[PDB]
Amino acid sequence: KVFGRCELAAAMKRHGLDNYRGYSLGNWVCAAKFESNFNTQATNRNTDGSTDYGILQINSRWWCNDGRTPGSRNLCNIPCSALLSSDITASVNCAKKIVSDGNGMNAWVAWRNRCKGTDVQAWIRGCRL
Ligand code: NA
Numbered sequence: 762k763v764f765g766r767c768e769l770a771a772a773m774k775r776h777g778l779d780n781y782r783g784y785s786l787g788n789w790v791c792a793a794k795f796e797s798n799f800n801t802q803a804t805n806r807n808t809d810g811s812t813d814y815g816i817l818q819i820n821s822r823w824w825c826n827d828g829r830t831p832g833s834r835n836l837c838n839i840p841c842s843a844l845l846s847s848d849i850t851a852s853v854n855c856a857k858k859i860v861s862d863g864n865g866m867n868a869w870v871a872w873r874n875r876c877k878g879t880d881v882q883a884w885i886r887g888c889r890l
Pocket of ligand 1: 874
């Protein structure tokens with residue numbers, strides 16, 4: 762599914778992300794834009810044998826089980842396929858764990874490169890939720 766911008770903001774809001782750990786809804790929407798272009802099916806295989814899954818490009822080295830990644834942990838207690846669903850529940854719950862793990866939203870490289878320190882409220886302009 763490719764979400765619309767405000768459609769995603771609304772779903773994220775319903776799932777309790779706005780101001781979760783102090784991160785505004787625009788930060789979350791911006792992260793999804795640059796991690797996956799709002800595509801729930803996005804995947805990326807890394808040279809290290811891990812894979813990033815879903816709308817928030819969550820990595821299998823630590824966060825989910827894909828059956829093929831080294832270490833390896835499953836800190837969100839999910840199969841990585843759950844991160845590829847059209848509904849964002851699993852991704853949101855896992856993101857809440859990640860953002861709480863000691864690096865904040867800096868765990869998302871595309872958020873660091875395109876969102877951090879920017880006027881991220883722009884990502885919810887016109888949504889009026
Ligand atoms: Na860059």
